[PDB]
């Protein structure tokens, strides 16, 4: 089986062994698509994913490889963006970006700040009770977003009564 991805006009793709690099105006991303007997190459202005194998396991990865590459095209052009909101009930939670990590202070009244380091060239812009995570690498972006929500995770008490935390409000 073989699939051909026509690459967008503002974009450029390049191979280097098992690594692929996609570059658009919104930046660039480099990934690794290493699976047995699956060749990923850049032919002219198209990316080809092919293999002589057609078993369920090989077909699975081909489809995964495709989405990964279409996501890269989208990342370097329209970019990826996740929206978030901070909802607190009693203790005023302070969310801020300090350095390369987001810091949440006074969560549920805690005296110690919780923090998570941002992934890659992902930019986190906070404005009021809203947060917005964006960047070319969806993996890097997706994690950062999730990382922030996970940062206000609570296991000890009943979640139905304690909901203070930063939640993902918009998924691309």
């Amino acid at each position: 089986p073989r699939v051909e991805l026509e690459i967008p006009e503002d974009v450029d793709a390049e191979q280097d062994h098992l690594d692929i690099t996609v570059e658009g105006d919104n930046g660039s991303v480099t990934r690794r698509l290493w699976y047995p007997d699956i060749d990923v190459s850049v032919d002219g202005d198209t990316v080809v994913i092919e293999s002589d194998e057609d078993n369920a396991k090989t077909m699975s990865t081909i489809g995964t490889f495709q989405s990964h590459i279409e996501n890269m095209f989208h990342g370097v052009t329209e970019g990826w963006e996740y929206g978030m909101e901070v909802f607190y009930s009693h203790f005023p939670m302070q969310v801020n970006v300090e350095g390369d990590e987001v810091v949440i202070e006074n969560f549920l009244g805690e005296k110690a700040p919780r923090r998570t380091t941002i992934h890659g060239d992902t930019d986190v812009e906070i404005d009021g009770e809203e947060l917005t995570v964006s960047g070319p690498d969806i993996e890097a972006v997706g994690q950062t977003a999730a990382d922030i929500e996970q940062l206000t995770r609570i296991n000890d008490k009943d979640v139905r009564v304690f909901q203070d935390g930063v939640y993902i409000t918009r998924k691309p």
Binding site: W34, Y35, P36, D37, D39
Partner: protein, 142 residues
């Protein structure tokens, strides 16, 4: 140092067992073999299961002792010893005329033995001697 080897083998990306089999076969044939780039030789299968086996060998022991190597140096040379009658004169001789190295201390690029190469493009479930060594705690000298 200085090991006047008749044969210099390149274990880079090669099935450790399969290389060891041929190297022993040759040492017993009188050849002086130098295995190079041990840190880069490989062994196929699930890394987690493979490491459990090598970790178990490290935990085993007692007063009499069961010294088991952790660096690719020894993991490999031990592997080869398991394919030699090292407690015998003839077998100790062969084994002693065999040395394994980290990287390549020689000027020549070692040769690749037939059938011993692993094709990274067709395999994903395999591990590097170097990776085992690091997981086993060895001081990454290479």
């Amino acid at each position: 140092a200085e090991f006047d080897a008749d044969v210099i083998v390149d274990a880079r990306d090669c099935i450790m067992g399969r290389v060891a089999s041929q190297v022993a076969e040759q040492a017993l044939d009188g050849e002086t073999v130098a295995v190079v780039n041990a840190e880069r030789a490989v062994i196929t299968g699930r890394e987690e299961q493979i490491v459990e086996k090598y970790e178990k060998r490290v935990d085993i022991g007692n007063d009499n002792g069961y010294f088991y190597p952790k660096r690719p140096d020894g993991i490999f040379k031990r592997t080869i010893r398991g394919m030699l009658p090292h407690k015998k004169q003839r077998g100790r001789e062969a084994f002693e005329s065999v040395r394994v190295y980290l990287g390549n201390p020689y000027d020549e690029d070692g040769e690749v033995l037939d059938g011993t190469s692993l094709d990274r493009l067709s395999n994903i479930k395999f591990v590097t001697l170097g990776e085992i060594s690091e997981t086993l705690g060895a001081n990454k000298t290479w």
